[PDB]
Symmetry: D2
Subunit: 294 residues, 4 copies
């Protein structure tokens, strides 16, 4: 096979080492790790080489984007150029772009029939009481966002709390914001990692005693997971709907059933690899091998 594979990222972290590793090992591929920010190119005379530190890049059979949440406009532009040059991407630019927008993505998942928690959208709602009654929740989660980021989640246990919180963020200097109801669960969500058409690995993320969260480390403790066939199907459908080749789907276990809470196009590998012992980076290179033309 022997492919030249580029990896779009800003630095060297476990994920970056684990695939330089798995690509050099597996069918003896060459790997260059490029900062997207350091790429520069003529978007005009259509295609045209990509430049990096004064030299022309040599044509990659494939590109592995792993673009940061704060560099996603330029990142996807550079990604787009690689695509136009013939490189196969796991996760294509459009898909990556759209996925960063949690609003667009939640909308899309909902339209395609995927069970989410009931969720409200707002920015400067003008009648908070009506917004709270919509969504139904008396206890619910409010998630501040600002553009396409996320700068906070918070639980509002009472009506008044939910009121004061929304009224706080309403001062648009916090910008777009999301309401959805809290769970049974217990600060425990399941993170499935999809590569192509299968769930490749899956862990339970568990909260700490102080309120909830559950985030990777907002106090989070990982443990290996027992996914139901139903959860497995869902997490694969979610990625398919988002047109993501690699994705992290987070699932909450509600009484009514499993609910998708979020979908990531650049899931971290370390926690989930170390927890399960699964060679995820390898399943990714393997996927490239099945799909990239050389």
């Amino acid at each position: 096979s022997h492919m030249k594979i580029a990896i779009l990222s800003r630095d060297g972290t476990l994920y970056s080492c684990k695939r330089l590793r798995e690509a050099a090992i597996q069918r003896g591929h060459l790997v260059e790790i490029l900062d997207p920010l350091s790429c520069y190119m003529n978007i005009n005379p259509a295609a045209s080489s990509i430049h990096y530190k004064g030299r022309k890049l040599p044509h990659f059979d494939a590109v592995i984007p792993r673009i940061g949440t704060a560099i996603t406009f330029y990142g996807t532009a550079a990604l787009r150029q690689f695509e136009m040059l013939g490189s196969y991407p796991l996760n294509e630019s459009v898909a990556i772009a759209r996925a960063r927008d949690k609003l667009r993505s939640m909308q899309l998942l909902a339209r395609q029939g995927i069970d989410l928690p009931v969720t409200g959208i707002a920015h400067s709602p003008d009648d908070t009481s009506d917004l709270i009654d919509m969504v139904g929740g008396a206890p619910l989660v409010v998630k501040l966002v600002e553009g396409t980021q996320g700068i906070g989640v918070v639980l509002a246990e009472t009506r008044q709390a939910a009121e004061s919180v929304i009224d706080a963020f309403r001062g648009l200097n916090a910008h777009i914001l999301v309401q959805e109801y809290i769970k049974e669960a217990q600060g425990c969500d399941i993170r499935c990692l999809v590569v192509g058409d299968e769930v490749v690995a899956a862990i339970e993320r568990r909260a700490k005693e102080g309120d909830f969260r559950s985030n990777l480390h907002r106090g989070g403790a990982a443990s290996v997971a027992s996914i139901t066939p139903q959860e497995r199907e869902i997490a694969i459908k979610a990625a398919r709907t988002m047109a993501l080749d690699v994705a992290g789907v987070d699932i909450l276990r509600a009484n009514r059933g499993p609910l998708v809470m979020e979908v990531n196009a650049s899931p971290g590998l370390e926690g989930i690899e170390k927890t399960t012992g699964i060679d995820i980076a390898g399943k990714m290179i393997r996927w490239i091998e099945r799909h990239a033309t050389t």
Copy 2:
């Protein structure tokens, strides 16, 4: 006919008055002008009504988005909900979203065969000299952007100027940036306004004595325009490529021929309407009449 038409904008300016005007006059349509930021809704149980100041909106046959460049994530979300409810939009969410990204849009136009000025893309280029030689320019225009905004253009007449400018912005706190070569022209660009499959109006925008620009009012003076059939074709193709129903295409007259410099999905009406006397707002309502189902 009698349609209910919503207009998505944050305030009442000429454009907003001129179509409340033209819609109430023309086939007696009703019009509500809504702040997108004041809309709130359940993106979950797919579709679901849109709320505004404590009440449910009553279903619009059509929506005219005119979303601001700084509110485009939430704006398009609200737009998307109207679309999911059955409202026809002139300019659809996806198209609007993509168009805000000048990088993606320049790329797309270039791929589809549309003559642009030669243009470079960069963020933190690491070898400015190579970047300047690429693009070729010895005098060229550098356009700072930051996300999806634009916070400056500047002419660099010499190599050294172009160097110091790029090196200035390279400190990423300016983020993404665009290089392209300057013109003959003379601070004069042509702005065509496309509605559907025709150019509906067109003006010459003329710079002032102090350097160049030409911007609406960076010193700009408008006058009525004599578009060549070729320019006309191009400006229509550009909008088609971008999948925009209404668009402002800006064209520079180079020796080699007309070049598209920019495409806007929310062109201002005042300057161009007053300059030409053309009823543009009416051609927009008319377009809705030909395409919205009631």
Copy 3:
């Protein structure tokens, strides 16, 4: 007398007209209104002229700073240069600078013996429950700030509300934040305007039905005020403590007595002038006349 007076502000609003007016009328002074942002100067060879639109400014006997809350670093720099050139300022740079910092100012007022509401300071407090118990409040006001701005106030009626709010802002992307207890009062605060050593005018600002606020227009309705001699003394002491020549002091009427809530170095004139009929702009020019050397 005949002074040349400069006014540092970014535009022409009532305040700006009302003193061009009162200075040309009163002892026939000349007035130039300058954008601080348009001033440029050598901070080196100590003193040195200030340049404005290509020319050297002609030496002002006095400067009236009215610098915006978002331009206060450069504004005060330009102010400082005028001071170094010999111009008398009503409100000096240091005083203006310090006053913009509500934290430093609240601290200072408290140290000097001036009754404030009980007030807590926090940024990323780590134990919200302890923070709420400190301050004592079960209902209290949380005021988000971010640098030196203010981007929100909110009432938290219960413990849980106060919790969810603080936890929301704790995500430092909101930065510094202030807790203090709510009042009897009733959305009514008294705004006194101090010029030199007297309160020159004073209005009642009254909230609307929807929650509280009281802000100028967050729904605010003004009416003429009956200040107690005690309130009068306090508002004069506050300005003295802050070393402000002109200041807006806001006072809340608590059971225990009058409490200073805020001190502004650039109070607006329109609402308070129109409400009372007092010639405030004139008392300001008069103050300059008593203190500037010609």
Copy 4:
């Protein structure tokens, strides 16, 4: 002696270790290292304890502020509270605050007779040519700032370069900006470190081949320095003028003589300690011992 010493900083870096080290070793002082952001307190009932992670801090004989450039408003507030509680600070709040403002500080140094390079100040100058002629430079350095930060320096070798650069930043989204002329020197500046009334250590910082800079590591290489008695006097006067107990003064060797380029209230220790072998952290604790009351 035996003092309790608090160190205000956000994390554990060499500087933070080297004084936990030197304070526990030297006259057996106790040391707590506190995040300023985690402090919370009643700025009202004047003084009042400082809270940290749910508990009351136990009263420090001294505080060593080492506050970050992006947290300086809240940092100095917390600092101020310690001061009000009786703790001696090396570097007091006012001094630290003022020092962060490079504009105010450059002004002050200039007024007090300290030779700087000739320096211009601007934000949106309206006539760049006049600004460049002022300052005199044909080659000069332009330093972008934005509030109180610094987000770039750049050399402009020609008039045109200097023009395009200033015109670029003029789009206020870059905000305040500084012009001063370039040097002989050669990317080499001298950094002196003042503790109290002496220069305690001093290094040469040397640029790399690619343009200039010289910054700690913008390519910087350190080497031990031979300060003239004159340079020594100056660096001590600068700190005295700024009322800083500990400061980093940077000096450029011009033909006309040594020029102060910058003064820092929180100089890094690592580069300069390792380069010279001097126990700087110890001279700081020693200074506290000579000045703090127990």
